[PDB]
């Protein structure tokens, strides 16, 4: 302002950015086998 004349200018600006990525997992595998022989029929148990 100079002296009548008056001037005023105000500017405001804000920005915000956010990113969140999360991944959690588990996989399990297990195999077991057997084999046997027996050299009366009652013993088959």
């Amino acid at each position: 302002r100079v002296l009548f004349a008056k001037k005023t200018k105000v500017e405001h600006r804000c920005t915000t950015n956010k990113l969140s990525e999360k991944h959690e997992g588990s996989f399990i595998q297990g195999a077991e086998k057997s084999i046997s022989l027996i050299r009366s029929e009652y013993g088959a148990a």
Partner: protein
């Protein structure tokens, strides 16, 4: 963002933006087999 300019007069400005997105996926599967082979005794024979 808000910008207000006045020179003598009054000015008012307001702006708001909101964004929210969520994405989740779950995948589970199993495959298993059970093989078994046995044989009786049957002491008899056909030795003829």
């Amino acid at each position: 963002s808000s910008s207000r300019k006045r020179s003598f007069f009054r000015s008012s400005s307001s702006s708001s933006r909101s964004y929210t997105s969520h994405t989740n996926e779950i995948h589970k599967g199993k495959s298993y087999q059970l093989l078994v082979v046995e044989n009786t005794v049957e002491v008899a024979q056909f030795i003829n």
